[PDB]
Amino acid sequence: DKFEKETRGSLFGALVHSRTNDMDIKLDMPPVPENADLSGLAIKVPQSI
Amino acid sequence: IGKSINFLHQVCHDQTPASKAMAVGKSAESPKDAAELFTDLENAFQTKIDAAYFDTSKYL
Amino acid sequence: LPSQETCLVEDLLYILIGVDGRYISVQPLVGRQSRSFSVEQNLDSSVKELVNRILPVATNYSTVTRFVEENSSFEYGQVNHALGAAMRTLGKEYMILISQLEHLQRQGLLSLQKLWFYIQPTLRTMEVLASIATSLNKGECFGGATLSLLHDRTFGYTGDSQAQELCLYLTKAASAPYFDILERWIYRGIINDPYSEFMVEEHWDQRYTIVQQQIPSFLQKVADK
Amino acid sequence: LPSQETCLVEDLLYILIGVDGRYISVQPLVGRQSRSFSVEQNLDSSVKELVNRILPVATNYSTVTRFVEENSSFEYGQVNHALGAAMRTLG
Amino acid sequence: ETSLVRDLLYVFQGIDGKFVKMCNSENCYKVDGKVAVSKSLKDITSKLSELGWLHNKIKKYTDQRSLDRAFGLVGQSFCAALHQELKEYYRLLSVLHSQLQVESSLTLRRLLVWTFDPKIRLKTLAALVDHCQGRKGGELASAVHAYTKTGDPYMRSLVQHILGLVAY
Description:
Family (chain E): Belongs to the TUBGCP family.
Shape of chain A: elongated
Organism (chain E): Xenopus laevis (African clawed frog)
Distance between the termini of chain C: 70 Å
Largest sheet of chain A: none
Largest sheet of chain C: 2 strands, antiparallel
Largest interface: C-E, 28 and 20 residues
Radius of gyration of chain C: 22 Å
Strand content of chain C: under 5%
Order of helices and strands of chain C: HEEHHHHHHHEEH
Helix content of chain C: 55-70%
Function (chain E): Necessary for the recruitment of gamma-tubulin to the centrosome and for the formation of a functional centrosome.
Strand order of the largest sheet of chain C: 1-2
Protein name (chain E): Gamma-tubulin complex component 3 homolog
Subcellular location (chain E): Cytoplasm, Cytoskeleton, Microtubule organizing center, Centrosome
Structural class of chain A: mainly alpha
Number of helices of chain A: 2
Structural class of chain C: mainly alpha
Radius of gyration of chain A: 15 Å
Helix content of chain A: 10-25%
Oligomer: part of a larger assembly
Number of strands of chain C: 4
């Protein structure tokens, strides 16, 4: 059940923005950061806690 | 363990070895595997077959 | 004529993700490391040099992705397959600022010099992943000796914050397999993997075959232990 | 193209309880034991995915018809008439 | 452009769409006789090509069983797995139509990558079935376990769900 809820929520991993059981949510990436225009950017790095 | 249950069928009984606590176990197991994520047990599965093994061998 | 200047900007972003152009032609080479891309020449000598300046930056990514997304998938399942799948995971998050960049387009609002200034920190970031891809292909390292190069690398480099952060992260997710088979060997006493990763390779008082070619990534004193 | 798309949705809802559609022709083969459906010549080329809704309602009626035939006429109170009532509750 | 966006929904939903690909094998490549189009559409057709092909590989095994009582056991608990990860292949297909029909609405590089995480999930599931066409018990239980010996916990979990259900 944990696998199903997690999978169903993440829309097969195609949502990396939050988990929700919604099939009518628009898939949007966050707008360009504040300081991007100053610092450029580099790749984002995630964590485990 | 499957050979030994057949030797008390040459003694003829419908008894699950010794106690009826072996019988409760079948009922407990079927929900416990069903409720899980999709995962089967198998490091714990070999642990209660010891407790089944010593039971049906001394009893036979 | 000024439209051809934005058209070369949009064409570059497909080179950048490592696929075929719209007017920038792709050479075939096998074992390629830098395949030549022939640009559409432009009529003013200054906008064409700018696209040649960004051009190794798109090339060096596209190559080091193309073979680690497949070479890893061929592997037997050692720690380096866990490493090599983790580069593909990291290549997911690369594609988010590029997919957001084209989101800002529906007319020209970018230039070539803004493209390079946006990826300027990220070009040091991909090329320190290029040197991992290069060594592991030269040796064709087995799983004990990958981690032995890789250890020293995330602890012999400093040059960018977000770069050291990743090369720790992904070596720590390749060391985590290795550490777990250590715990199965130092607590239970079993040793099971497709291909052995340790010095010990079981079967007088001989019971082991020992080598110094697959020793732990850390100094040889812990390997004796 | 979207106008035909919402149409074949609508028309499917009428078909689904094992009843006559609008542009979907149903003909009983042997006494309502089998019924072949004939989808309209579509102006989109989702024709293969239309037939992947045909086979769900294909296997629909041949449950329903069989058991309304069992429990009303065969007169076996034991099981047949009783289970026909059960499957009617799942209907 | 946008016609191809409604077209790419249909080999995911089944097989074929707007312009026929003429094969349920090999790789499910665009056939439409349009080459005076740009070559980068062509590169997105070759991504799509192994998306639609990897979908039609999952249909073959559960439809070759065409539910039979002979090996009613273990063969069909694996098909129930194949049905549960199909349903989800359709579930990201539906948030992609909800983007299409709004009451960007056209694809980008976003979904171009998004699709490939299901490809590598469904590839894990292609690798479990190419190994064993057999329906015989304990032969499928030795088939899916040889993919749980491998490195990387990412697909290991995916094969644990199947090995837990093959075992059930």
